């Protein structure tokens, strides 16, 4: 018996109005806003990596070892 | 017996109005907004990687090792 | 016996109005908005990768190792 | 028997209005806002990594060793 | 029997209005705001790593040893 | 006078506008004007008497949602001698 | 005067507009004007009497959703002598 | 006079605008104007009497949501001799 | 006079604007104007009597949400002799 | 006079603006104007009598949320002889 990340709700009544609710959020990206106004961007790239935009990554994994959620704007030359 | 990421709701009544609800969110990307107004972008690329737009990635995996959710704007020259 | 990512709801009554509901979201991309107004973009590419648009990827996998959800704007020259 | 990250709520009444709710947030990125107005950016890159945009990463993993959530703007040349 | 990071709420009444709620936040990034106005940035990079944008990373892991949540703007040349 | 020109190029765009007026636009947005949501009423034994003589009476469980642009929204109006010249 | 020109190019676009006025546009949007959602009523033993003499009475469980552009929305209106000249 | 020019380039954009006026825009936004949400009422034994003579009465459990642009929103209005010249 | 020029380049942008006026914009925002949220009422044995003669009475459990732009929002108004010239 | 120039470059941007006026903008913001939140009322045995003669009475459990732009918000107004010339 083991509980992990469990939302539990219980209610009891006889007469009237009863409301029961449960919510669970795991690995959730919520509410990302970006505004660019009159922005000047000049990029010169020679064999590299340049990142300018908006990146939103949400990952949920079970029994996963060595997982990478996001890898943005990198140069890898492993031998 | 094992519980993981479980939303549970229970309700009981005799007379009236009863509401029971349960929600679960795993690896969810919600609410991404981007606005660009009068933006100037000049890009010169020679053999590289340039990223300017909007990227939204949501991944849910079970029993997956070494998984990568997002890999944006990279140069890889492994030997 | 094992529960993972399970939404459960139960309700009981005798007289009146009863509502029971359950929702589950796994690997879901929701609500992506992008607006570009009077935007100038000049791109010169020679053998590279340039990404400017909007990308929304949602992936759900079971028993999958090494899976990649999104790989946007990259140059790969592995030997 | 073991409880970890569990939200529990219980309520009881006879007559009236009763509200029961439970919420759980694990590895959640919420409320990221970015505004750039009249911003000038000039980037010259030769074999490197340059990151300018907005990155929001949320990762939840169970039984995962060595996992990396985000790796942004790096140069790796391991031998 | 072991409790860790558990939010518990209980209420009882006979007549009237009763409210019971429980919330849990683990590894949550909330409320990040950034504004740049009339900002001039000139970057020249030769084989290095330069980071200028906004990064928000939230990671929750169970039974994970050696995990790294964020690694931003680094040069690694391990032998 | 508004003049835009582009000469001796490979890719060229020349746009000139005298007067411009933008409008309203909605992208991925939700709106709620005059919305009644989630009303629950429980009554066991209610004794009610109404005696109306030339009036406006609104009685019982009432849920009204209204949205008017160039008009008035009323629930109970007992008036008289309404004229427009 | 508005002039736009493009000469000696390979790909060229020249657009000139004197006066421009944008309009309204909806993209992936939801709207709710005058909406009644989720009304639940439970009554066991209700005794009700109504005596109406020249009036407007709204009685019982009532759910009204209205949307008017160039008119008035009313639920109960007991008026008299309405004239327009 | 507004002049924009671009000569002897490979990629060139020349835009000139005399007068410009931006508008309203919504991107991923939610709006709530005149919204009634989450009303719960429990009554066991209510004795109620109403005697109305030429008036406006609003009685019982009432949930009203209104949104007017160029009009007035009223719940109970007992007036008389309304004229417009 | 407003002049913008760009000559002898590889990538060039030239924009000139005489007069500019920005507008309102919402990005990932929530708004609540005239919102009633979370009202709970419990009554066991209420005895209530109303005697109305040419007036406006608002009675019982009432939840009103209003939003007006160019109009007035009233709940109970007992007036007389309203004229506009 | 406003002049912006850029010559003999590889990447060049030249922007000139005579008069500029920014506007309002919301990014990831929440607003609450005229909001009633979390009202709970419990009554056991209430005896109430109302005698109204040409007046405005607001009675009982009342929750009112109002938002007006170019109008007045009133709850109970017993006036007379309202004229506009
Ligand atoms: C709702 C209600 C109930 C009972 C008592 C009243 C006063 C009201 N309020 C109104 O009628 C508001 N109104 N008035 C006028 C003008 C007018 C009214 C009556 C007769 C002649 C002219 C009007 C004209 C054109 C389109 C809309 C409207 C409008 O909406
Ligand atoms: C709804 C209601 C019930 C009972 C009492 C009243 C006063 C109202 N309110 C209104 O009739 C509002 N109204 N008035 C007028 C003007 C008019 C009304 C009656 C007779 C002659 C002219 C009107 C004209 C054209 C299109 C719409 C409308 C409109 O909508
Ligand atoms: C709601 C209500 C109930 C009972 C008593 C009253 C005074 C009100 N309030 C109003 O009628 C407000 N109003 N008035 C006028 C002008 C007018 C009214 C009546 C007769 C002739 C002209 C009007 C004209 C055109 C479109 C809207 C409206 C409007 O909305
Ligand atoms: C709400 C209410 C109830 C009972 C008593 C009163 C005074 C009010 N208040 C108002 O009617 C406010 N008002 N007045 C006028 C002007 C006008 C009113 C009546 C007759 C002729 C002209 C008006 C005109 C056009 C569109 C809106 C309106 C408006 O909204
Ligand atoms: C709310 C209320 C209840 C009972 C008593 C009163 C005085 C008020 N207050 C107001 O009516 C405020 N008001 N007045 C006027 C002007 C006017 C009013 C009546 C008749 C003729 C002209 C008005 C005109 C146009 C649009 C809005 C309005 C407005 O909102």
**What is the DSSP secondary-structure string of chain J?**
-EEEEEES-SEEEEEEEEEEE---EEES-EEEEEEEEEEEEEEEEEEEEEEEESSEEE-SSEEEE--BSSS-EEEEE----EEE-
Q: Which residues of chain I have a CB within 8 Å of the CB of B38?
A: 15
CA distance C34 to F27: 8
Task: Identify whether the C-beta of residue D50 lies closer than 8 Å to the C-beta of residue E43.
Answer: yes
Which of C16, C17, C35 lies at the smallest CB-CB distance from F27?
A: C35
CA distance B47 to B53: 19
Q: Which chains touch J (3 or more CB pairs under 8 A)?
A: A, B, D, E, H, I
CA distance B42 to C42: 5
Task: Identify whether the C-beta of residue A39 lies closer than 8 Å to the C-beta of residue B37.
Answer: no
Strand residue runs (E) in D6-53: 7-12, 15-22, 25-26, 29-37, 40-46, 49-51
Sign for the CA dihedral angle at J44, J49, J52, J55 comes to negative
Task: Identify whether the C-beta of residue G53 lies closer than 8 Å to the C-beta of residue G70.
Answer: no
Six-digit token pair at E61?
């892991």
Q: For residue H77, how many other CB atoms are within 10 A of its CB?
A: 27
Burial of J47 (0-12, 13-18, 19+ CB in 10 A): exposed
Task: Identify whether the C-beta of residue F49 lies closer than 8 Å to the C-beta of residue H50.
Answer: yes
CA distance A72 to G63: 54
CA distance F64 to F75: 8
> From the centroid of its chain, how far is CA H37?
16
Residue G69 CB less than 6 A away from ligand 2: no
Task: Identify whether the C-beta of residue C16 lies closer than 8 Å to the C-beta of residue B16.
Answer: yes
End-to-end CA distance of chain A: 47
Six-digit token pair at F59?
């009685």
Query: Exposure string (b/e) for E3-35, b if CB count within 10 Å is 16 or more?
Result: eeebbebebeeebbbbbbbbebbbbbbeebeee
CA distance H50 to H45: 17
Ligand 5, atom 25: nearest CA belongs to which residue? I71
Listed residue (J23, G20, H28, D40) closest to B56, CA to CA:
H28
CA distance E51 to E32: 17
φ, ψ for residue H78, nearest 5 deg: -110, 95
Residue with tokens 């090792």, as numbered in its chain: B65
Residue F66 CB less than 6 A away from ligand 3: no
Task: Identify whether the C-beta of residue A71 lies closer than 8 Å to the C-beta of residue E72.
Answer: no
What secondary structure does DSSP assign to A38-71, as a single string?
Answer: S-EEEEEEESSEEE-SEEEEEEEEES-SS-EEEE
Q: Which residues, 6+ apart, have CB-to-CB distance to F1 below 8 Å? A: G1, G2, G3, H1, H2
Q: Which residues of chain J have a CB within 8 Å of the CB of E33?
A: 28
Listed residue (F51, H50, J36) closest to I58, CA to CA:
H50
Instruction: Provide the residue range defining the domain that includes G42.
Output: 1-85
Q: CA G69, G75, G81 angle in degrees (round to 5)?
A: 90
Helices (H) and strands (E) in chain H — how many of each? 0, 8
C2 to chain G, minimum CA–CA distance in Å? 36
Method used to obtain the model: cryo-EM
Mutate to test the pocket of ligand 2, among F66, F76, F77 (most ligand atoms within 8 A of CB): F77
What distances in angstroms separate CA D30 from CA B23, B58, D33, one per listed residue? 18, 15, 10
Q: Which residues, 6+ apart, have CB-to-CB distance to G54 below 8 Å? A: F53, F54, G78
CB contact under 8 A, B15 and G40: no
Listed residue (E9, I38, C14, D26) closest to A10, CA to CA:
E9
- Strands H11-21 and I11-21, bridge-based pairing: parallel
CA distance F34 to F73: 11
Task: Identify whether the C-beta of residue J17 lies closer than 8 Å to the C-beta of residue I20.
Answer: yes
Six-digit token pair at B15?
């007379």
Q: Which residues of chain H have a CB within 8 Å of the CB of A33?
A: 28
CA distance D19 to D1: 29
Local structure of residue D10 (DSSP, 8 states): E
Query: Exposure string (b/e) for E37-55, b if CB count within 10 Å is 16 or more?
Result: eeeeeebebeebbbbbbbb
CB contact under 8 A, E17 and I42: yes
Six-digit token pair at F75?
């629930």
Sign for the CA dihedral angle at A59, A60, A61, A65 comes to positive
Local structure of residue H68 (DSSP, 8 states): B
Q: Which residues, 6+ apart, have CB-to-CB distance to G56 below 8 Å? A: F55, F56, F57, G76, G77, G78
Task: Identify whether the C-beta of residue C36 lies closer than 8 Å to the C-beta of residue C4.
Answer: no
Find the radius of gyration of the CA atoms of chain A: 23
- Beta partners for residue C9, in sequence order: B9
CA distance E44 to E62: 41
- Beta partners for residue F74, in sequence order: G74, H74
Q: For residue A28, how many other CB atoms are within 10 A of its CB?
A: 27
Strand residue runs (E) in B1-79: 3-4, 7-12, 15-22, 25-26, 29-37, 40-46, 49-51, 54-62, 68-76
Local structure of residue F50 (DSSP, 8 states): E
Q: Which residues, 6+ apart, have CB-to-CB distance to D57 below 8 Å? A: A29, A55, A56, A57, A58, A59, A69, A70, D29, D69, D70, E56, E57, E58, E70
Q: For residue J80, how many other CB atoms are within 10 A of its CB?
A: 12
Mutate to test the pocket of ligand 5, among I72, I73, I74 (most ligand atoms within 8 A of CB): I72
Task: Identify whether the C-beta of residue H8 lies closer than 8 Å to the C-beta of residue I8.
Answer: yes
Residue H77 CB less than 6 A away from ligand 4: yes
Task: Identify whether the C-beta of residue H60 lies closer than 8 Å to the C-beta of residue F63.
Answer: no
Task: Identify whether the C-beta of residue H76 lies closer than 8 Å to the C-beta of residue G77.
Answer: no
> From the centroid of its chain, how far is CA C66?
18
Mutate to test the pocket of ligand 3, among H68, H73, H75, H82 (most ligand atoms within 8 A of CB): H82
What secondary structure does DSSP assign to G4-19, as a single string?
Answer: EEEES-SEEEEEEEEE
> From the centroid of its chain, how far is CA G51?
35
Six-digit token pair at E29?
């990034």
Find the radius of gyration of the CA atoms of chain J: 29
Which residues sit directly before a break in chain G (C to N > 2.5 Å)?
A: none
What distances in angstroms separate CA B34 from CA B52, D42, E39, G31, one per listed residue? 12, 22, 20, 21
Which bin fits H10, alpha (ψ -120 to 50), beta or left (φ > 0)? alpha
CA distance B40 to B43: 10
Q: Which residues, 6+ apart, have CB-to-CB distance to I57 below 8 Å? A: H55, H56, H57, H58, H76, I50, I76, J50, J52, J56, J57, J59
Task: Identify whether the C-beta of residue B75 lies closer than 8 Å to the C-beta of residue C74.
Answer: yes
Local structure of residue D63 (DSSP, 8 states): S
Six-digit token pair at G7?
């000469």
Ligand 2, atom 28: nearest CA belongs to which residue? G71
CA distance D27 to C39: 35
Strand residue runs (E) in chain I: 2-7, 11-21, 25-27, 30-53, 56-58, 62-65, 73-77, 82-84
- Which helix (H) or strand (E) element contains residue H42? strand H30-53
CA distance A34 to J28: 9
CB contact under 8 A, E37 and D39: yes
Q: For residue I85, how many other CB atoms are within 10 A of its CB?
A: 9
Q: CA F16, I23, F28 angle in degrees (round to 5)?
A: 100
Task: Identify whether the C-beta of residue A67 lies closer than 8 Å to the C-beta of residue B66.
Answer: yes
Tell me the CB-side half-sphere exposure of residue D17, using CA atoms within 13 A.
24
Which residues sit directly before a break in chain C (C to N > 2.5 Å)?
A: none
CB contact under 8 A, A55 and D59: no
CA distance F56 to E29: 55
CA distance A1 to E36: 51
Q: What count of residues does chain J have?
A: 85
Query: Exposure string (b/e) for C25-54, b if CB count within 10 Å is 16 or more?
Result: bbbbbbbbbbbeebebbbbbeeebbbbbeb
Local structure of residue E77 (DSSP, 8 states): -
D13 to chain H, minimum CA–CA distance in Å? 13
CA distance C37 to C57: 25
Residue with tokens 């020029």, as numbered in its chain: I5
End-to-end CA distance of chain G: 50
Listed residue (A35, H69, C40, E30) closest to F27, CA to CA:
A35
Task: Identify whether the C-beta of residue F55 lies closer than 8 Å to the C-beta of residue G52.
Answer: no
CA distance G6 to F3: 11
Local structure of residue I68 (DSSP, 8 states): B
CA distance H38 to J38: 10
CA distance A67 to G27: 37
Which bin fits G36, alpha (ψ -120 to 50), beta or left (φ > 0)? beta
Task: Identify whether the C-beta of residue J12 lies closer than 8 Å to the C-beta of residue I4.
Answer: no
Query: Exposure string (b/e) for F51-68, b if CB count within 10 Å is 16 or more?
Result: bbbbbbbbbbbbbbbbbb
CA distance F84 to C19: 51
Cα dihedral G65→G68→G74→G79 (10° resolution): -160
Q: Which residues, 6+ apart, have CB-to-CB distance to F39 below 8 Å? A: F63, G38, G39, G40, H36, H39, H40, H63
Q: CA E27, C70, C48 angle in degrees (round to 5)?
A: 125
Residue G72 CB less than 6 A away from ligand 2: yes
Q: For residue I80, how many other CB atoms are within 10 A of its CB?
A: 18
CA distance G73 to H73: 10
Six-digit token pair at E41?
């940035």
CA distance C31 to C27: 13
Chain I contact residues (CB < 8 Å to A): 25, 27-29, 40, 42
CA distance H6 to J7: 10
Which bin fits F34, alpha (ψ -120 to 50), beta or left (φ > 0)? left
Q: What count of residues does chain F have?
A: 85
- How many independent structural domains does chain F possess? 1
In the sheet with A15-22, reading across from the earlier edge strand, the strands are: C15-22, B15-22, A15-22, D15-22, E15-22
CA distance D72 to D60: 18
Find the radius of gyration of the CA atoms of chain D: 23
Full 3-state SS string of C24-53: CEECCEEEEEEEEECCEEEEEEECCEEECC
Six-digit token pair at A12?
């009891």
Resolution of the coordinates, Å? 2.9
CA distance D10 to A8: 8
Q: For residue H69, how many other CB atoms are within 10 A of its CB?
A: 17
3-state secondary structure of A78: coil
CA distance E29 to A71: 19
Listed residue (B78, A38, H18, A39) closest to F19, CA to CA:
H18
The domain that holds I49 is classified in CATH as 1.10.287.700
Task: Identify whether the C-beta of residue J7 lies closer than 8 Å to the C-beta of residue I7.
Answer: yes
Listed residue (E48, J5, E43) closest to A41, CA to CA:
E43
CB contact under 8 A, I11 and C40: no
Residue G82 CB less than 6 A away from ligand 2: yes
């Amino acid at each position: 018996k083991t509980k992990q990340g469990v939302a539990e709700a219980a209610g009891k009544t006889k007469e009237g109005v009863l409301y029961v609710g449960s919510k669970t959020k795991e690995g959730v990206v919520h509410g990302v806003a970006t505004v660019a106004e009159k922005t000047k961007e000049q990029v010169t790239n020679v064999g590299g990596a340049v990142v300018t935009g908006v990146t939103a990554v949400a990952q949920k994994t079970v029994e996963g070892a060595g997982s990478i959620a996001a890898a943005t704007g990198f140069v890898k030359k492993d031998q």
